[model samples]
Target chain A: QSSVSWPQNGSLNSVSAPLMSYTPISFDAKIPVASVDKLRKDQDLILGTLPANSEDAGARGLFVRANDDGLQITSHGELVLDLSKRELAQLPADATIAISATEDETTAGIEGDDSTTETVERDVRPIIMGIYTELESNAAADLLNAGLNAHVEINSRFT
Target chain B: QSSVSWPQNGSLNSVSAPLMSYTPISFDAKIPVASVDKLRKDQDLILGTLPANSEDAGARGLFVRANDDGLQITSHGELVLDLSKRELAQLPADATIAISATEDETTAGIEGDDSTTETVERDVRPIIMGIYTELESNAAADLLNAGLNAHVEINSR
Candidate 1:
């Protein structure tokens, strides 16, 4: 002998945005000046290129080399190596590699002053981006034998 | 030499709700008349109760009995059993039991008519709720040996 009722003509719309001290940056490159190409029988991929002389050599901007020795990311003209291909090749064909870079900034001056100063106070590191594919094999058995165990727990808040 | 710039002072706020043909119902009961209590060495839990005579017997409304034999839910005096305790006991201690009920309604009338009619088209079903704890054992090895293979593939849009 109980019942409930309410008006049936209710409607609503909503939008949300996060707060940030600085404007968000887009992920796209400023220009299409960067290019990646395969070399050495497709065993290696080179992004951008190094200048042979000072004549631009048609290869300017940042460069990254991916091969068996790993990712040789270039900062300006210097080269740095990360996770070698041998290690990446050990992963199952279903695995993916994600690469990214980040930077920090500093601002100094009076709180509401137009004369406040902002500076990019560090060297820009090299940036590399790509995916790795392993040769086909018994990936299922290999992963199972890796002895990886995963556990998850969940609880409801009705209590 | 590339750079990006935009206004430093920007703010926004918004709200939204969905459209529905019927008013939404709340999950709370009309009154605090329903209750649950444990019995039989804390292994058996009873919800509501059955009347023993024409008088209110203090045991009225819906009744649900949960025990080693499983959940015995009563609907207008009829009993229905869902998943048994044997099956629930086999789950890991971290597992949970979630019980709920639903119903349907029909409304017939012309569009925008003040005399529109709505009717409940089905009987209310019995509802049961509780949690179960299994005796400690080698749950890890048991699950791994169950030969249960789970695979998930994800794609980015």
Candidate 2:
């Protein structure tokens, strides 16, 4: 049982935010994923780079900042997402990362405009919501050298 | 133990690809990263979704195709990077990956620029040549279901 509830009420034609429906939902609650665009305005953000004495390469502005508490990701000033530092180390080093969601049709339109009852399909589609800054070229090496083990680079040319 | 010889003889302001120079150069030899644009004209490419019968989700065509030989990634058939499937599983699922290289000078230009005997620092910085790929939302789940623990959704929309 989890404390948070993932809403699954929205559809492709609904008025509210579309529901995130996929095949066999299997999200490790330990690894947190947040939308960068929807953070509150009060969060603290470092614009350029961290202190010269900073050792965590990921905290150097262009990448996610891993702190004593957990992993903090922010776009500009808004706090987007957070993850467990223990789990964050399990990811790759040199790779681009994107925040993606899917608006699934739990119940599709049947035939005519009568509306209400709809056909539900098993296939789920994905929609990319937003993107975060990529890891700098030296991010992997820096993280590895610091014993973070995690490495990620969001290449602008590739995206 | 690997056959790939990483050449570190390029510099900044040069026309060739910049080399990646780091503190400790550790890389699995099986992963192949190549520019799809530079590949020979005869290489084969599959544009749309991969065949349904394929077992590897990486080969399903929504994302890069992984095989027993290596990992194949194409930027719309232009720049394709390859890596080992074993190594590919070690990356994050929701990521847009790229092979990045940067040219850096250890010591900045001091005083004058008069040709001869220029005060050089630690030679030139090596290019950080590596791959970066975005993970599809279902990448982890798909990879896990297949007994390999992966989920990659190279979504279109």
Candidate 3:
């Protein structure tokens, strides 16, 4: 259903670009986890302050951009994965959103700000990619535990 | 109830796309942070030992994959952040991650021996525009700590 096709048969059109594969895939904790010194950091990004203007944020930037709980689905489908074995549902009980694929666009470097400093110019693409937890909290966190019982082997993809 | 508009019209979408502002607003974190190194370690992501099908490792083509801890929401709205910030109930406590939008997508068009690599490929174009995030760890570790607040910003477009 995607504009691009998966080329099981290789050719110039081959489109495999696997971005993330996490067993304990969960939320990005849009808030801070800890401090290095007195200074709080942006996951080790060393640009001093986060970009406020679109340009300063550069071509590479990631924000816990929502105050509301952020779910990661970009498609029309409900959450994917079997968790009933652990006694959990797919989406959280509070989910009021029916986010669909129409809200997004495939990414490209052409969209990034080329004028940014080399340091800032680095892409923040993967940060947001990983923050993509389509599920709600408690159940989502259940997957974040540091135990083999919670590890994942598949890389969930979307349209 | 929002003071933005329709206060008089009692309707939404009154303003045209040209009239609406680009770069919608979202909540950000406050100071006093943690997990900066975790973020930095991501920035520090490099050519590690590319072993084959090790314990929990794989060739993952270009992107590396893992099964650590994961989060999911039930059909219900009950929520739990990675770590709770009772002070900021609106968002999660930590916000660092192994993957991020700030990082680049540099793996395309690489010269490789096709035999070891799986020839199967998928469309990755839509991820940039549609995908979004909820929160992260202490980015302040190696990253900068502007503040300790997390919020979502939406676009009607």
Candidate 4:
């Protein structure tokens, strides 16, 4: 479409989005943010936005423009990502399993060697969010069987 | 734009679309009829007329035609069917969920049958569909403290 028009229907305007991003939104945190971002861009979002300008005092608005021209992602544009099964099906399927976990840590080597005032966040949690309906198919039976439950990877087409 | 013009880049042809509406073997809503007379009116149709009393069976094809008004949806159109969560989140936390169970008499009944014992159809295993995001925010963190576990819904704008 051209410009995103105002919605006639709406995002559940009645409910509020989590105001924070670093809340433990479950998934495989054992993997790094780079990995998690790659794993399920479609399934996750940090609960809240960082301040408008990370350098500024308040919230920031980011815009991203990308196409055949290439991705022009910016800090201004927060990412709403999806899994890119760039790799083929193997022992660790592209997106079959998800795990997220966390552990708290304290700072050291600053003025106080064992200062515990600061909390250091680390990933240790792992949760299999879900299986998904995989490849969109051409044949009726194939489409009928679309699911993360779908273990078969077959020929694909685009045009 | 008037019906006479089109959304930029959507113009199927630079030639007067009056002909496109009637183009025989192609998809177009300009001509709603699937008949030889309708086919004849199409400028692109090669006039392969038969002898005066020859028996001829002309053909018609099927496909979608983009309409300027409304959703602009057409046959075989790429509907932005976002199987994503934000779309799912548009509902409320109290959004209702329903379950259904039924027993069919015939195997054919459970899986429809026609000429052969098997006829394939799109399966719609609708599930517990709507859940608005309930963000449990943490006060101090960059991307929620890793290892912390909480539900994260799908994101679609």
Candidate 5:
């Protein structure tokens, strides 16, 4: 379990201050599906290249590596949702990721002081999230699909 | 970056011992794709039920929540692959997850002391991983798909 600093007061200043202050955190938790050694032994393979690294690629978090034995595909990391907490964590602080979330109201510039102050109405909602990653080649995608299938098989035994 | 305690020596005991020792880790890092409030205001909705909580459901890590205003779907968490480390982490230490990884070897009982030590040839392979989740109803699956598409649109901008 981890703790995040949320906005304290209803005031706009407190909300906006943390926007720049909070640093987004990243987590690594890959569940291996297949063995690299097995792929190399099964068939004669050709060398393949990886996609250029970028924020978009980092956001997707899927990677393919050409090992000495054979080619391997892996999910670099994942975006997770914590149901009990009702909060989303482990997002890249920078907007380099593939998903987005928006609230119903704009709270950035509301003025606090007024002789006859107007009532502030704001509505917030639960967040919906997603991430996207693409393979450079169809063969690479096939390998990824195969890996995912293998992962399912392994999990089946325990379930 | 994290360090996992992998089997160091090629000996069978070393490989087997660590297997029972390492506790699987779970992670939560949801990238928000849409606002729950928006869904609620869009249309009239009915109350729905969630799937029974089980190891399989947890492994899939996809969830649905019904808010006062609307319904929302979320990825409870994800299985990640760390390339630089060449290792998969954040898996449930217990075999409750949906994916599996296996290496080619039978190193459990190769005795160390022998008059003439027999050569042990073992093979390991690159790990392939996948997870599966099912919704209780088609409506739920549709909502989840809609949420995923919304997530894609949000990510687009």
Candidate 6:
């Protein structure tokens, strides 16, 4: 007889996540502003002004620039979907997007306090939040699907 | 400032197995004869014959039957698609697929006869032997793509 019972209700998504320190939406949290910005540089965003003459554009009427090169990623290493202005415009504009990712914390021993204990590994945890936005359901699903497929590791492909 | 180096040699078939795993005719292995039958019940197989039950007049010619089901899995508890039969049809008439799963084991106590004894976690591993199989470049691609897409875990729903 088979000893293992099927997952009555389980992790049906067997594909792995990107081999990285980041977590999935399962542990959603607020990403640091700086991390979010760094990812933006790598993403495909739409700018209202041309890069060659950025000064003249100055966030003008409607230009196409890029966001985080990564579609689903957060500063804390959470997979997120940073939609470009053009991409977002295609959606209802009022849709709510739930975001998730991991957070890290370091605690150095204090000179003489309760915090003066011994520790090696830092604290890591998952977080979740909701924001109003608009995006394609299929597109969103693909982003999540692709992220889940990334086995646990540092896939420079996404970095 | 685009540092996103395209996978010049990446995701060639993120939609399929690593090209090397099925390079038109690359990684070849034997599969367990018995395991093939199991997946057949789950997956649609192209059948050449059927049992005698006159009640149904089937399309009597070379046909297909289903072949996906529970198979040997990984320590991570993943169901692997052992496509030995379907793949063999392309090769000779026969090939084997030896598959196995993880069974955790733990040993308590130190090697020194006088050393203290203690229990902790267990060790786990995956076993495999003859296992093989492929498709329309498109159809075959879909089979592996679907399998590789199995996300990393369970969903409550």
Q: List where candidate 5 sits over 4 angstroms from the true fold.
A: A1-159, B1-26, B29-34, B40-64, B68-157
Model 2 Cα shift for residue A89 (angstroms)? 5.6
Give the top-scoring candidate (DockQ). Answer: 6
Best of the two (2, 4) by TM-score: 2
The docking category that best describes candidate 1 is incorrect
In candidate 2, what are the lDDT values of residues B38-119, reduced to their tens digit? 2224433211123323344232122334445445543212223454666545444432232211122122111123221122
Q: For candidate 3, what is the TM-score? A: 0.16
What are the lDDT figures for the candidates, one per model? Answer: 0.26, 0.25, 0.20, 0.19, 0.21, 0.23
Q: What is every candidate's alpha-carbon RMSD to the true fold?
A: 23.7, 27.0, 26.9, 26.1, 29.8, 20.2
TM-score of every candidate = 0.20, 0.16, 0.16, 0.14, 0.15, 0.19
lDDT leader: 1
Candidate 1: segments with Cα more than 4 A from true spot: A1-43, A49-60, A78-81, A105-122, A125-159, B1-157
The all-Cα superposition gives candidate 5 an RMSD in Å to the true structure of 29.8
Which stretches of model 2 miss by more than 4 angstroms?
A1-63, A89-159, B1-157
Query: Can you give the lDDT of residue B10 in candidate 6?
Result: 27
What value does the lDDT take at residue A8 in candidate 4?
A: 11
Per-residue alpha-carbon lDDT of model 1 for B51-150, expressed as tens digits?
2232332222233455666544443343322436664454354332221222342222212333422233443322111111111222223332322111
Worst 10 residues of 4 chain A by lDDT: A150-159
lDDT of 3 by residue, B1-157 (tens): 0011110132111121111111112211122223222323323211111222323222121221111222211101112112223322322344322211111111111122332112113221111111111123333223333222222232221
Clashes of 6: 76
Which is the winner by lDDT between candidate 1 and candidate 4? Answer: 1
| TM match of model 5 to true structure | 0.15
lDDT of 5 by residue, B21-123 (tens): 1111221112112222223343221211113343454333333343442233323222221111111122212211111112222111112223212212332
lDDT per residue (tens digit) for residues A8-126 in model 5: 22211111110001111221112122222223332321211113333444333333333443333323233121111111122212211111112232111111223212221332211
Report i-RMS for every model: 24.6, 18.9, 22.2, 22.4, 19.5, 15.7
